[PDB]
Write a protein that binds this ligand. Structure first.
Ligand code: HEC
Ligand code: HEC
Ligand SMILES: [Zn+2]
Ligand SMILES: [Zn+2]
Ligand SMILES: [Zn+2]
Ligand SMILES: [Zn+2]
Ligand SMILES: [Zn+2]
Lengths: 106, 106
């Protein structure tokens, strides 16, 4: 999928987690976010003029998704333990990772 | 100053901005935050075992302070224009930069 689709997958599933009732719903949404993050990691920021994979800012761009995936994995551990409220709170901590990349690249 | 002092300078002055009344108070606090950020940029994260300046994660650590300084400079432009409420809102956007580095390194 393209970057827009991957970001809206992240966006919609974060909301699903917030409104979820049980561990299975949270797990399903986090699983979809993880795949969307790794897919988006292959894209480039539109406003970044230098697209070279070896450039510092492309390393930083991909690094940001590795951090996001790590946080998603933290939340998945809680969801797999059945800790719904805890997993929802962990998903809340994602938001500053989203907002940070956005401010930096958009 | 050491890392602890620099972080509490950032911490206390962010609160000063939130409670400020005029552009001069906001400007003074942002100016102190900027210096504290550049000083902290010379430190290393305690829990990072590899301290080599050329390592990717030390590049990332220093990069995070350059981003923070850029955001402080955005807020300073508004404060120097007398736009108090706008500068306070810009200081609010700093928080995800703080929280992101913290989650990543602490
Ligand atoms: C964390 C969970 C999130 C969430 C919820 C979103 N993102 Fe991102 N994002 C990144 C870039 C470069 C863009 C610009 C895309 C473009 O200009 O084409 C975006 C954009 C978005 C949107 C807006 C989509 C739109 O309609 O324009 C949304 C809703 C969104 N994102 C959600 C880059 C990154 C990251 C790189 C390291 C990370 C992490 C995130 N985004 C994280 C998130
Ligand atoms: C943005 C405006 C902020 C604010 C308000 C704070 N920081 Fe940081 N910070 C960083 C690291 C590596 C640490 C660990 C320090 C240690 O373990 O010795 C901290 C710690 C803090 C604290 C806690 C101080 C304490 O009493 O333990 C506080 C209050 C704090 N910070 C405020 C690293 C970074 C960054 C690197 C890129 C950035 C940016 C920030 N911090 C940003 C902020
Ligand atoms: Zn969209
Ligand atoms: Zn960068
Ligand atoms: Zn302290
Ligand atoms: Zn890093
Ligand atoms: Zn970063």
């Amino acid at each position: 999928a393209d970057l827009e689709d991957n970001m809206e997958t992240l966006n919609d599933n974060l909301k699903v987690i917030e409104k979820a009732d049980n561990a299975a719903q949270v797990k399903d949404a986090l699983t979809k976010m993880r795949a969307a993050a790794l897919d988006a990691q292959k894209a480039t920021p539109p406003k970044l003029e230098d697209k070279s994979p070896d450039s510092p800012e492309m390393w930083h761009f991909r690094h940001g998704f590795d951090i996001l995936v790590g946080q998603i994995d933290d939340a998945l551990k809680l969801a797999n333990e059945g800790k719904v409220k805890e997993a929802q709170a962990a998903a809340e901590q994602l938001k500053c990772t989203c907002n940070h990349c956005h401010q930096h690249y958009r």
